Amino acid sequence: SHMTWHILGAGSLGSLWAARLGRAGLPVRLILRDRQRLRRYQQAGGLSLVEDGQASLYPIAAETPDGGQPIQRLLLACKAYDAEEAASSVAHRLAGNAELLLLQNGLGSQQAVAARLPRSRCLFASSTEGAFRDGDFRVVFAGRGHTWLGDPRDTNAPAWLTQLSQAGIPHSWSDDILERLWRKLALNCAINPLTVLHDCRNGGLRQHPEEIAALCDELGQLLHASGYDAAARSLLEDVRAVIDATAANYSSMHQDVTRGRRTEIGYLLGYACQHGQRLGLPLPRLGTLLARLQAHLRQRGLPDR
Numbered sequence: 653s654h655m656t657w658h659i660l661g662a663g664s665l666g667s668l669w670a671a672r673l674g675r676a677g678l679p680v681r682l683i684l685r686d687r688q689r690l691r692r693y694q695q696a697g698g699l700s701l702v703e704d705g706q707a708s709l710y711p712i713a714a715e716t717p718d719g720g721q722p723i724q725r726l727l728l729a730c731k732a733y734d735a736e737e738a739a740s741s742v743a744h745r746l747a748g749n750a751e752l753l754l755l756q757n758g759l760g761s762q763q764a765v766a767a768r769l770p771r772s773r774c775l776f777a778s779s780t781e782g783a784f785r786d787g788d789f790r791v792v793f794a795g796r797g798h799t800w801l802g803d804p805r806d807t808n809a810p811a812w813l814t815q816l817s818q819a820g821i822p823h824s825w826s827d828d829i830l831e832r833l834w835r836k837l838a839l840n841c842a843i844n845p846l847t848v849l850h851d852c853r854n855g856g857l858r859q860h861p862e863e864i865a866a867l868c869d870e871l872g873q874l875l876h877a878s879g880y881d882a883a884a885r886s887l888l889e890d891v892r893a894v895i896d897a898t899a900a901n902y903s904s905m906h907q908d909v910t911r912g913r914r915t916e917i918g919y920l921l922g923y924a925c926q927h928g929q930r931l932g933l934p935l936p937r938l939g940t941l942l943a944r945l946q947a948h949l950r951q952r953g954l955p956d957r
């Protein structure tokens with residue numbers, strides 16, 4: 653017997669983690685937004701996970717942010733633009749020894765979450781697992797992936813990693829986790845903004861070879877000035893590699909705009925532009941790219957941040 657896994661943000665990845673953790677015998681508790689969400693979830697009976705067309709019900713225990721026991725280990729699995737507000741809703745339940753697993757893409761929310769929960773350890777995650785919602789409390793395990801974990805302040809790995817190994821959650825500890833998240837971010841900036849502006853699948857960016865190179869050019873300077881020469885070196889070939897590998901998919905940001913939902917631009921292309929200005933590094937093509945993408949979002953009534 654050991655620590656309960658508290659899950660905040662019962663979305664795509666949050667339900668996928670909650671299912672694999674709870675079904676492997678580990679103590680797991682979903683933190684649902686409010687009691688209405690809670691009594692709906694109890695009318696549903698649990699989380700429904702769809703694997704290769706097969707649905708399975710996982711009657712995981714759930715609660716609201718106000719009730720329950722202290723939280724010593726929490727998996728934050730909401731969007732980056734909700735992470736700070738989400739973590740604050742349970743700040744009254746963190747224990748001081750509490751550790752937080754931040755399953756947020758991009759950068760910005762992790763620092764903002766850690767700033768508001770100083771008595772708690774905030775670990776950074778970077779995941780390539782595919783999962784999408786098919787109704788409330790139903791998630792399809794779309795694609796297998798890998799999750800890098802790491803703490804920039806406390807680089808020693810926690811002993812509960814092997815619990816994730818027991819649960820079949822593939823992960824690797826990284827001592828330079830910031831180098832990981834910066835690699836995924838730079839890849840996002842080179843691909844996703846143009847997929848939205850050109851309304852194309854990732855394979856459509858082959859028809860824009862020069863423009864892809866100049867963005868990787870400026871994204872290369874940004875990584876180099878940030879201390880990641882390796883990421884800056886392989887960046888262009890890593891971008892061209894992912895393109896042909898995902899040539900048939902629409903990007904996550906293209907899918908967000910298609911559904912009329914908010915994007916994570918403020919923690920991806922916006923954050924990268926914010927960091928470049930902070931580094932005194934002129935990044936004009938990422939700047940005009942950010943301008944065109946923000947106007948593209950406003951044109952549809954979507955938040956440009």
Ligand SMILES: NC(=O)c1ccc[n+]([C@@H]2O[C@H](COP(=O)([O-])OP(=O)(O)OC[C@H]3O[C@@H](n4cnc5c(N)ncnc54)[C@H](O)[C@@H]3O)[C@@H](O)[C@H]2O)c1
Pocket residue numbers: 660661662663664665666684685729730731732734735737738739741755756757779780781782783784785916
């Ligand atoms: N395959 C994937 O889905 C995938 C892959 C890689 C990274 N990510 C990242 O994981 C994070 C979540 O992605 P997603 O697809 O699962 O989003 P999602 O919309 O499907 O899930 C978000 C859940 O958190 C809850 N949420 C938001 N704010 C909340 C709050 N203040 N209090 C309580 N709950 C709150 C939402 O209700 C929702 O159930 C994103 O940052 C994403 O970039 C997802």
Ligand SMILES: CC(C)(CO)C(=O)C(=O)O
Pocket residue numbers: 836839840843844854894898902903904905
């Ligand atoms: C960031 C990137 C390039 C990863 O494949 C992407 O296309 C997505 O998130 O949908």
